[PDB]
Amino acid sequence: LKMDQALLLIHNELLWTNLTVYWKSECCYHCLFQVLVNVPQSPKAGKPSAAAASVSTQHGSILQLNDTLEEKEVCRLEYRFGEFGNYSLLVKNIHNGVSEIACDLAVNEDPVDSNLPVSIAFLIGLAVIIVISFLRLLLSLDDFNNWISKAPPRLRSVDTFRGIALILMVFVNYGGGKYWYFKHASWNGLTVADLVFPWFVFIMGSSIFLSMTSILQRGCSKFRLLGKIAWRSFLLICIGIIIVNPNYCLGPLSWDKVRIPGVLQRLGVTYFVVAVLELLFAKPVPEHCASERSCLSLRDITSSWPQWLLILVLEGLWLGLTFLLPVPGCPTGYLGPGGIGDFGKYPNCTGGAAGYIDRLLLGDDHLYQHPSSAVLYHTEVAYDPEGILGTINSIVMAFLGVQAGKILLYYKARTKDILIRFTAWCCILGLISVALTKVSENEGFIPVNKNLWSLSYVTTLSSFAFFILLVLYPVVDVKGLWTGTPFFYPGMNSILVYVGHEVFENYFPFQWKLKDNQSHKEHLTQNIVATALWVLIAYILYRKKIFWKI
């Protein structure tokens, strides 16, 4: 059995009734019952005929056994299979009247625990093991030296947040233990991997405001800063396209089969747009007079009214292009995954208008040929999560990060003001997300979606980032209870860490040949070791004062 899969032997003892087994996962919102296996009728009385099936055990399993001769629901089962199980399913008619048919599912080999076979126990064990190995290696280095023979201040809270995002990104990009909740969700919903990129955009906006206002406060011509912004955005886009997006293990790059969009292209476009907007509408930062007061003081909001107006116009444009753009052969306002999703009536509608804009402007060949929904909804079209339409919400979230930077640097004298603004913004964005999503995964007006970069996705992740900053500012900056240790070294070497881990995805320290690739524990420990090694590399570069920028 493969990893995250369970055996299922269906024993059909029905003499004169054929069966076919339809399997649909629980995460499928509106999903077609994909066929699983066909179990023929029993050739002789008392001798059932069986078939072997491998039902996925990532999350939930709905089985419908339909008679093939007459398509009627013989029986249904809603059971959550466990990894590496047996699950001998017997389909038979009750002997009381030989009319009612009931299928009972019994387990013979107990499931091999996957999600919680490791837990904090194995986590702390691996941490202790790697710490002991690091200490032994450090001591051995001293043995080969002495025992061989006689012989504008940086915040560090934004750095800690960026380091947390980088650690999560390195963990989930390498596989995240191949766990289903450490990878991007299949279309709708929120997972651990979906939190990383919006937090990076938020932190990018905050750092945009911080660096821009510091540069303008010391002194610089706005044309020089505009040139720096354009050069950095161009470098980010080019780095993405050249070294970050393509998978060069498959062959040389092709002029007609290159993925133009990507994480760094979206970051560069967002950087250019929001940084140029803020530089054009740039005002000096006032020094706050009162302390722990001025609740109605909205200077950081009212003083940026042109930026807010343009951001609201952009968001309205995104909403209009999403809920109103006429997509050929597709319902207007489509937010579904296509394929077998939404009952399979729109197989080639992955993304709706957001994906249609990409497939119309950048071409189908220049998109992401393996979207997150391809494994669950079996979508056949290429959808790029970092598309053109989602760049609007990327810009909106970058400007929300800029607003966080405005909050944190306008009220730099008073900490209570910063905390009040942070909690007010977090509450406002959380209320907006609750209104949009109706605290539901697949329901609501605009459900959370990384692939579409939905408005509610942006608001939810911005509320999460505001809460993270609320709990990271007094702890790290003001009170200094915890100078975030395993985080701020990547927080200062983010670009180099990202570029390296993309370039060095498959290298010996970061991944090696496993005893069994169909194991969650081995993949988890390998990914944790790789993330720890990247943190160690960032710490080493910090100790050597090597900080790559731009």
Ligand X SMILES: CC(C)(COP(=O)(O)OP(=O)(O)OC[C@H]1O[C@@H](n2cnc3c(N)ncnc32)[C@H](O)[C@@H]1OP(=O)(O)O)[C@@H](O)C(=O)NCCC(=O)NCCS
Burial class (CB in 10 A: 0-12, 13-18, 19+), 170: buried
In the set 167, 170, 330, 381, which binds ligand NAG (CB under 6 A)? 381
Residue 377 DSSP class: T
Stretch that binds ligand X, among 156-164, 217-225, 419-427, 429-437 (CB under 6 A): 156-164
The question of whether 378 is a catalytic residue gets the answer no
Catalytic residue among 11, 95, 184, 501: 184
Q: Does 197 bind ligand X (CB under 6 A)?
A: yes
- Is the CB of residue 364 less than 8 Å from the CB of residue 355? no
Q: Can you tell me which residue has the tokens 């194991």?
A: 519
Cα-Cα-Cα-Cα torsion 333, 336, 342, 348, nearest 10 degrees, comes to: 90
Residue 338: CB minimum distance to a copy of itself, A = 30
Residue 351 DSSP class: T
Binding-site partner at residue 145 among ligand NAG, ligand X, a copy of itself, none, CB < 5 to 8 Å by type: a copy of itself
Q: Residue 117, Cβ neighbours under 10 Å: how many?
A: 14
Residue 382: CB minimum distance to ligand NAG, A = 8
Which residues inside 214-253 make contact with ligand X, applying CB under 6 A?
214-215
Q: Does 350 bind ligand NAG (CB under 6 A)?
A: no
Sign of CA pseudo-dihedral 167, 169, 172, 173:
negative
Which residues inside 55-114 make contact with ligand NAG, applying CB under 6 A?
64, 66, 68-69, 71-73, 86, 88, 108-109
Binding-site partner at residue 243 among ligand X, ligand NAG, a copy of itself, none, CB < 5 to 8 Å by type: a copy of itself
CA–CA separation, 66 and 38 (whole Å): 10
- Is the CB of residue 66 less than 8 Å from the CB of residue 72? yes
Which residues inside 329-348 make contact with ligand NAG, applying CB under 6 A?
347-348
58: left (phi over 0), alpha (psi -120 to 50) or beta: alpha
Binding site for a copy of itself (CB under 8 A): 145, 148-149, 151, 223, 227, 242-243, 246, 248-249, 251-256, 503-504, 506-509, 511-514
- Nearer Cβ to ligand NAG (15/226): 15
CA–CA separation, 313 and 315 (whole Å): 5
Residue 233: CB minimum distance to ligand X, A = 10
- Nearer Cβ to ligand NAG (71/287): 71
Coil, strand or helix at 474? helix
Q: Does 369 bind ligand NAG (CB under 6 A)?
A: no
DSSP secondary structure of 63-130: EEEE-SSS--EEEEEE--PPTT---EEEEEE-TTTS--EEEEEE-SSPP---SSSSHHHHHHHHHHHH
**Angle at which helices 390-410 and 196-218 pack, to 10 degrees?**
50
Binding-site partner at residue 466 among ligand X, a copy of itself, ligand NAG, none, CB < 5 to 8 Å by type: none
Residues of this chain that bind ligand X (CB under 6 A): 154-155, 158-159, 162, 169, 173, 196-197, 200, 203-204, 207-208, 210-211, 214-215, 263, 267, 494-495, 498, 549-550
Residues of this chain that bind ligand NAG (CB under 6 A): 7, 16-18, 22, 33, 40-41, 64, 66, 68-69, 71-73, 86, 88, 108-109, 347-348, 380-381
Active site amino acids: 184
